[PDB]
Design a protein around this ligand. Sequence first.
Ligand SMILES: Nc1ncnc2c1ncn2[C@@H]1O[C@H](COP(=O)(O)OP(=O)(O)CP(=O)(O)O)[C@@H](O)[C@H]1O
Ligand SMILES: Nc1ncnc2c1ncn2[C@@H]1O[C@H](COP(=O)(O)OP(=O)(O)CP(=O)(O)O)[C@@H](O)[C@H]1O
Ligand SMILES: Nc1ncnc2c1ncn2[C@@H]1O[C@H](COP(=O)(O)OP(=O)(O)CP(=O)(O)O)[C@@H](O)[C@H]1O
Ligand SMILES: O=c1ccn([C@@H]2O[C@H](COP(=O)(O)OP(=O)(O)OP(=O)(O)O)[C@@H](O)[C@H]2O)c(=O)[nH]1
Ligand SMILES: O=c1ccn([C@@H]2O[C@H](COP(=O)(O)OP(=O)(O)OP(=O)(O)O)[C@@H](O)[C@H]2O)c(=O)[nH]1
Ligand SMILES: O=c1ccn([C@@H]2O[C@H](COP(=O)(O)OP(=O)(O)OP(=O)(O)O)[C@@H](O)[C@H]2O)c(=O)[nH]1
Ligand SMILES: *CC(=O)CC[C@H](N)C(=O)O
Ligand SMILES: *CC(=O)CC[C@H](N)C(=O)O
Ligand SMILES: *CC(=O)CC[C@H](N)C(=O)O
Ligand SMILES: [Mg+2]
Ligand SMILES: [Mg+2]
Ligand SMILES: [Mg+2]
Lengths: 534, 534, 534
Amino acid sequence: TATKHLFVSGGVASSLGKGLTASSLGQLLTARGLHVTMQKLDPYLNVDPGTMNPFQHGEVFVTEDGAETDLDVGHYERFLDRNLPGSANVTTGQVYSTVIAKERRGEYLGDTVQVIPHITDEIKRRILAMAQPDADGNRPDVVITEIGGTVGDIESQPFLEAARQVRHYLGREDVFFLHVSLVPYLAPSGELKTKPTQHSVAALRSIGITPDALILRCDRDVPEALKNKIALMCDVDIDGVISTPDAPSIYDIPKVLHREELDAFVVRRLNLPFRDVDWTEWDDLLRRVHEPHETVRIALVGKYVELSDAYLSVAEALRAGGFKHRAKVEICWVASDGCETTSGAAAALGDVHGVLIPGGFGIRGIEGKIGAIAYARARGLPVLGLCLGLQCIVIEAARSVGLTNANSAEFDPDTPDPVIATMGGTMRLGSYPAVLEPDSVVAQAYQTTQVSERHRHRYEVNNAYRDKIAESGLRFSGTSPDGHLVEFVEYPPDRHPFVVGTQAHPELKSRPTRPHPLFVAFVGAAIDYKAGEL
Amino acid sequence: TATKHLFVSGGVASSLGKGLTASSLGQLLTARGLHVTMQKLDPYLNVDPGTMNPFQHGEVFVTEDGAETDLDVGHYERFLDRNLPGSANVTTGQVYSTVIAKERRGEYLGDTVQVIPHITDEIKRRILAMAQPDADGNRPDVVITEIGGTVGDIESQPFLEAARQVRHYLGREDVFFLHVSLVPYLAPSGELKTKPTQHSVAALRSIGITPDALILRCDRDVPEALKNKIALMCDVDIDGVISTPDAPSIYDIPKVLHREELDAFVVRRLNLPFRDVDWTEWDDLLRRVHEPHETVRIALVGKYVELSDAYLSVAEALRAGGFKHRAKVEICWVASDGCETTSGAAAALGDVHGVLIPGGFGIRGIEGKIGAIAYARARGLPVLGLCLGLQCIVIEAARSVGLTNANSAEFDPDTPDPVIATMGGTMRLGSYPAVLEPDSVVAQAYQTTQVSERHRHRYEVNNAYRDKIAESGLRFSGTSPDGHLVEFVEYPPDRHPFVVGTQAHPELKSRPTRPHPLFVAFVGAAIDYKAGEL
Amino acid sequence: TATKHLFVSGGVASSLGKGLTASSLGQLLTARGLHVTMQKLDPYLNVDPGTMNPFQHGEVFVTEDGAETDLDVGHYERFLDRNLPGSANVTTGQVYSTVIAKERRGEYLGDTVQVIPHITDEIKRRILAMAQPDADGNRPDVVITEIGGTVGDIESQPFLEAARQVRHYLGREDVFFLHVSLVPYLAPSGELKTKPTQHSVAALRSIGITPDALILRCDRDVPEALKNKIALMCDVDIDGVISTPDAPSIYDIPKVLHREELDAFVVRRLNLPFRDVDWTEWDDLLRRVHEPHETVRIALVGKYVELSDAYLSVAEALRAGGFKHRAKVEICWVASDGCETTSGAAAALGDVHGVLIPGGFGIRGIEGKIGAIAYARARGLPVLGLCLGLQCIVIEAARSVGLTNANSAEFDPDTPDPVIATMGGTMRLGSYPAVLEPDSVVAQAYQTTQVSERHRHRYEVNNAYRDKIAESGLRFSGTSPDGHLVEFVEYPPDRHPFVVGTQAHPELKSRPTRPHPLFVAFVGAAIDYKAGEL
Ligand SMILES: Nc1ncnc2c1ncn2[C@@H]1O[C@H](COP(=O)(O)OP(=O)(O)CP(=O)(O)O)[C@@H](O)[C@H]1O
Ligand SMILES: Nc1ncnc2c1ncn2[C@@H]1O[C@H](COP(=O)(O)OP(=O)(O)CP(=O)(O)O)[C@@H](O)[C@H]1O
Ligand SMILES: Nc1ncnc2c1ncn2[C@@H]1O[C@H](COP(=O)(O)OP(=O)(O)CP(=O)(O)O)[C@@H](O)[C@H]1O
Ligand SMILES: O=c1ccn([C@@H]2O[C@H](COP(=O)(O)OP(=O)(O)OP(=O)(O)O)[C@@H](O)[C@H]2O)c(=O)[nH]1
Ligand SMILES: O=c1ccn([C@@H]2O[C@H](COP(=O)(O)OP(=O)(O)OP(=O)(O)O)[C@@H](O)[C@H]2O)c(=O)[nH]1
Ligand SMILES: O=c1ccn([C@@H]2O[C@H](COP(=O)(O)OP(=O)(O)OP(=O)(O)O)[C@@H](O)[C@H]2O)c(=O)[nH]1
Ligand SMILES: *CC(=O)CC[C@H](N)C(=O)O
Ligand SMILES: *CC(=O)CC[C@H](N)C(=O)O
Ligand SMILES: *CC(=O)CC[C@H](N)C(=O)O
Ligand SMILES: [Mg+2]
Ligand SMILES: [Mg+2]
Ligand SMILES: [Mg+2]
């Protein structure tokens, strides 16, 4: 049948969890054998999130095709176990620059270029593009489009109008509206309130959209009497009124939605091929999530100590590495600035079982990350470095063999030894192939000598320093196919059981149901270190 | 005191006449000795109206500084008798491209770039820029900002939010909101309806704006009982409820607003220096408008026969030329396509007293305009050619002396004689100086040999053909100061009493209270032709 | 099938003609063989319109069962040719007093009595009651419910909410929403505007109602391009976008709606039994409306004659009387106060062909109505008196025979001769039987001696004065079955060709397709007077 469009909107307030609810619905539909693709509409004017501070706004996700996207695409890829195109993230910035650029070229042939229909046609074009056959030739069954911003706000109006037009042009049989609302609890009276959902749905209806179902985000179960009140006042089928209480883990959200039979309601309402959910893969994940056999502590040596969306894909990849070993990864958020000195690094990393040095696109404090690697090497702690992490492993190795002032030309342009430098240079974005040295730590982890990983960097290992850096025992165990670019570094296992660096972001290809081989090997080495210390 | 901001919004429906009401208020405040400047906020995405078809969307106005703007700037200049900057026209296209370009350069330093505050800050910046001292050093007393689009529509939301923020930041003492509404008449019941104004004001209030006054656009006088109902339901001072019935001429609108004492209400509400209106100049204009001593028929040989906004400044300049002679100019709208043949041109121009060949930026049908000039020359009819008009006078002169296939390379790239060609070339926009031949028709009209006029063209008279074209008797009576570019052409008065062409758009510098010298001389020649035919 | 509910709402402004559009649709569906009943929901607090000044708010219609209702019930009866129950008019006043009375008796059993659901349940009950089998045992096919007030106003909110709940409970298959909007014309630009319809439909959608069709009230045909714009922006089937221009006569509206195929769209959308319209009866009416063979002038001697709805059923009955004779009745609206003196009555009634003295519930000036009858008797003008009219005929007869101070005790309680008096008394409402004198003017008009007419009065002919009044020649040609109450009066044809009075309101039983026998005889006598004057 025709590709179906399922729009996810939000009401009352932001940060209710629309993205994770949409992803969980995507997981449930995928588990029913449906081909699901997902898309995020971001009402911000940044053409891409590359200009945003990730320490304030969250990580930048990078797709296989090299697009810098909102972190939500990461949630979609993790719940669908699918590579999404750069088209899966639409911003107001992209839409307006595209339309204005076409206007300047005279492509609208003398027309007054307007929000309606020219801006809404562009958004609609980007929504409908998701229903085109992919590279393998497959057309999706369902396109889940998450509409960023809140209903009733100015910024979301062109997106919501485009979604209303998609419904008008494709008909009610091919389009479904899911609206996420808040049911707050008032502690003095002890009651849940439906009034915000009532008003939010009236604002949604006022812009021409009739919700087919409602996600009632709450800190508790929404009683049947409240669901009945909402069904009546909002004119939503009672089977489409979904009590969605805060879940203990993000992996529990599909079970919350399935208990309320939201996915079965969606399949019936869109007249999609029906098949029962195959719970094999997700039940296996939930056993690894809720029933670990051991705990392991990993230091994430980033900008700060607060649990951060700036390292979301890294944190998820670490946990997934744990799941593979039926282990619980406890992340010790360590501020890199505190690891600069040997006593500072000892106080911060003395009780961990592994040290992860993550990526740091646009950051400035590097001496703390180098300090953490120097401590971990001496302590015998496993190390996994990602992009900036590999660069810090390379800088620390060069300094350990006499190049005292070795650095990246990015962080010290006046360094006499730029062991990390541009090839200014070439920004490497998206998937790049690498060839691994057979029997190396990285080749043993991947169980192959030919791999591909996603990149986001313009600084590379300076090849003029390979022989000098190798004096530390560090091996260039992975390179580009022509051998010019260093892609992976590692110490021999007889010197350090696990010290590995990668120029790429393997965390982006990690899934909770498909852990990344490097994170599996890293967590495995951390479990080994813990057992050796007992 | 502080520069005041007066915002003009529209409700119920578009095309009510907001621009002319704002201009008329601008005239009334100017006549009270206040320094008034005006600005139009256009919600369209066209960075400038240059890509719009003027035959569908109206003429492009060109300012002294060379900006291509909405025709509304023309209304402002005509009612204020002032040159306005390119900043007097803000479009959504300009705002979004400026903000997106700053975002791409990293000027927002890691911020999420949003409609609020980044888009609204840019609009607010453009509104507040109008309050800066001009080139002569003068700061305006009042900035009248017309908000395009209708209240309740999506496209106007960022502009209205910016205006609300201007009020918030400057205070109620420095900001005034004027809302234009429709009071429709229902013929079966014979009654006027206030309900649309009631609902429009509630929509305006819902976005945070309280109107200080209301323009009640109607086909009849709004009775006191209806004004009282509106004052009460909309909470507007009865002195700010303005009955604005459709006026016989646009020049009558200041008298309609003054009778209702809107300008006195505005001056008192904004605590502006009070002075009575000096009616000397406007009463003089109204006597020329309503009490002409003679009538004269002028053919406007444009694309079509319907009264058009595509030639608004030309039509206004023709009427102003008439006012100077205490004459009524009757415009005979003649489709150029019908003047290609000698019999067609005779049928179309046989009963007129003058022929105006207007500008035609982006048009295709030129043979009809050349045909009209050939007929007018043989008939002894006065001719005034503007931009394309001069080019058509030059082409017709070249063909009359044997260059049968003479043309502009714009309309016939394969012409063996490109008498009009690029210097591709250089687009000339805005004010350019010209030096006139003393005792020429053009120098006698201007009463000076040094002039400046506004341009909008890239094709010029090909200097290689000057000697050949002059064989017709045509004189290059005006040039650029270095003598390289032809700016004016004319025939000797002994051959044709008035056949003049200009590369510029003198109509743009015309005002109803200050007619342009070329239009005064042209209409004067048309009055002479009429009298000679009696 | 199930009884269908068709709701008629209004937007933009009041007095657009919702009632006549609904009635015309009722006529079209009746002509397709459907059993249609109609109901008006009035948002005013008057329990019945009896306390309203009819000279400000329009006539009070009286049903067979004696309910005093809004004049709209009259339009319904005239277009359906059916007697409607008192239940066909619901007011806010009725609903709130019913619910408050139930609350005071404890019928809500400890509940908080609320607008939702208690007021809306009462309105819904009154809407659904219209679908119950009538006295003959027949259940209607369609109930057309007109919702008074304008969408977006406070007063209509409970009615609109009840209609939304009827849709929710019965489903989309049994409920249809028709929304009436205004398409205004802007004379300076010459354009029709769709913006008010766009905004009105968004307000209707915001309160939970999706219109199935739109009535576009306009002073001209709405072009296809504007209908296409509305279909797209309002998301209404193009087949349901109805151009409804101002019609020359109210009886032309069914043809306007049929041309746009609204009735066929309604029948298909509600899955009603389909049958073609039988145009026999209505085409016959339209020939009498548009092709009269003669014109006749009738004075309507009302207390206050603005040309208002205060005498709507009288004016319609006069026209229907004309139709029967293939004549056009021109109503000369005459203020009764000007007919008090014989010279005043001569100036006012000198050029008419008949004099109608209508009912005057709540009036104070009766001397002018008596003066008009005295003039008409002397002039030989036909007279038809309704309720107060009969009473004035009786008072004038008594005074013409020497009872100089004869009057009604209603207008002069101190009269020594109350020829009109109570039995205080008994208010007679609705249908009452009368027995007519065989071979009397009234029996010859009705062509029967047994009739029934609707009443609205408490004053009667004082039987103690029958012998004295009869001295004038006046006959008591119609009485109650027991002979106690005077129902009809007339002069013998050998004294006056046509001077008739009735205590009732025969105009209420008049239909354009079924003229009332008294109005047929009256207009016939007026045609005779005109012919005798030539
Ligand atoms: N059902 C649920 N229970 C608990 N936490 C939840 C949740 N749904 C979402 N979250 C939390 O919300 C966080 C942010 O993701 P979310 O889905 O809320 O984005 P969003 O759509 O509301 C905002 P934006 O569009 O700016 O990205 C997740 O990291 C997760 O921890
Ligand atoms: N009071 C009035 N009486 C008669 N005509 C009037 C009028 N006010 C305006 N008009 C007419 O309206 C025409 C268009 O100018 P107007 O002021 O209506 O623009 P606007 O602000 O409504 C639309 P936009 O923003 O797209 O330019 C004028 O050419 C004039 O003839
Ligand atoms: N198509 C049409 N052509 C001409 N006149 C029309 C018309 N439709 C309605 N009218 C006129 O409009 C007036 C108001 O009609 P109507 O009673 O139906 O309006 P309404 O329903 O808005 C008032 P209420 O609020 O009292 O119910 C009447 O004088 C009627 O004759
Ligand atoms: O009327 C409005 C208000 C706000 N916005 C948009 O809201 C966006 C901010 O998105 P948020 O959801 O964070 O709103 P908030 O900060 O105002 O309130 P909190 O829930 O965070 O406490 C901004 O990007 C702005 O464009 C509108 O579009 N319209
Ligand atoms: O909800 C809406 C509808 C329309 N619009 C905006 O209205 C603009 C069109 O401006 P108009 O005033 O011409 O509206 P219209 O054509 O829809 O109706 P008419 O009055 O002309 O009959 C378009 O440029 C669009 O962006 C909104 O911003 N929001
Ligand atoms: O927002 C509002 C305004 C008014 N009303 C209600 O409107 C009713 C008056 O109804 P009208 O339609 O007569 O309004 P109006 O007189 O103000 O304007 P026009 O006729 O000129 O169009 C009153 O009974 C009042 O309660 C609302 O319910 N809500
Ligand atoms: C990828 C990473 O962690 C840092 C990127 C840095 N700016 C670069 O190496 O180019
Ligand atoms: C100015 C005018 O009328 C036409 C401009 C034309 N395109 C040109 O000469 O460049
Ligand atoms: C019936 C009428 O209109 C006036 C008569 C008066 N109210 C009465 O007889 O009670
Ligand atoms: Mg999200
Ligand atoms: Mg304007
Ligand atoms: Mg009605």
